Ligand binder design. Structure first.
Ligand SMILES: Nc1ncnc2c1ncn2[C@@H]1O[C@H](COP(=O)(O)O)[C@H]2O[B@-]3(OCc4cc(F)ccc43)O[C@H]21
Length: 250
């Protein structure tokens, strides 16, 4: 399965404000989270934004105890069958919301060293996979790097502001094969120039996974200096113990 990462919504975009007001959902008084699905919890130190898709209608769900989750309905339904929600098999949202409506919102992401994070559009999110929410780590995810490059090179065109997208990458994982920002290395080496180059991106993804997990060393956090292979379960358990993440299966 995946690790779900609880990314706190701190201020909603203007186009969303009316909607949240109507449903008496105040993001400063209730705990409203975008829940991103990841397989690399050890890289959370390097989140530079959170991605949603313009093509997806998300639900805002009651997750109990004053928490609310923003995910696909598919994902929340699965969560209800493994004790992560207030009632087994119950998955009606309070309301639905299209990804475009959330663009520009402000967020706080667990363990991120960068501050002032925003919600940004990713056109290539697979609707049927995970939660439909993907957190952005350009140092080590080739998809994230390439999408970040396109947004930063033409922000006005994509309907975003340039200050929303961060291009100064702080290194998180050291490898001998690809240096300290393996996604940058691989995107250049394989000459990947578009987010829709799917077959090449999958090749880059797997090369990055292998080298990083088995041969990489942490450059940051409590486990700085440890091998990623040893540090990764510890980071995951730390996040879970602190209420910042959970596991779920599909
Ligand atoms: N609906 C969706 N559409 C597109 N991409 C999605 C997605 N849900 C999650 N992801 C992305 O794919 C990784 C798992 O891929 P596989 O399952 O192995 O193919 C996840 O972990 B990862 O999170 C942070 C991260 C950092 C990193 F250095 C590398 C990867 C990721 O990005 C997520």
């Amino acid at each position: 399965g995946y690790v779900g990462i609880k990314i706190r919504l701190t201020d909603v975009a203007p186009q969303a404000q009316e909607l949240f007001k109507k449903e008496s959902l105040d993001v400063k008084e209730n705990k409203v989270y975008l829940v991103a699905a990841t397989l690399r919890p050890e890289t959370m130190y390097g989140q530079t934004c959170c991605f949603v898709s313009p093509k997806i209608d998300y639900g805002v769900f009651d997750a109990g105890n004053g928490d609310y989750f923003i995910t696909t309905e598919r994902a929340f339904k699965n969560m209800s069958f493994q004790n992560l929600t207030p009632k087994r098999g119950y998955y009606k949202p309070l309301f639905t919301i299209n990804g475009k409506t959330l663009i520009g919102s402000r967020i706080d992401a667990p363990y991120a060293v960068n501050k002032n994070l925003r919600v940004l559009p990713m056109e290539t999110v697979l609707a049927t996979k995970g939660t439909g929410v993907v957190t952005c780590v350009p140092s080590d995810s080739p998809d994230d790097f390439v999408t970040t490059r396109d947004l930063a090179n033409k922000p006005e065109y994509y309907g975003i502001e340039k200050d929303w997208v961060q291009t100064d990458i702080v290194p998180i994982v050291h490898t001998e094969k690809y240096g300290d920002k393996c996604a940058e290395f691989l995107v250049n080496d394989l000459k990947i120039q578009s987010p829709k180059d799917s077959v090449q991106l999958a090749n880059a993804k797997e090369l990055a996974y292998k080298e990083g997990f088995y041969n990489g060393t942490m450059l940051i956090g409590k486990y700085k200096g440890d091998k990623v292979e040893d540090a990764k379960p510890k980071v995951k358990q730390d996040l879970i113990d602190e209420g910042l993440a959970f596991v779920y299966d599909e």
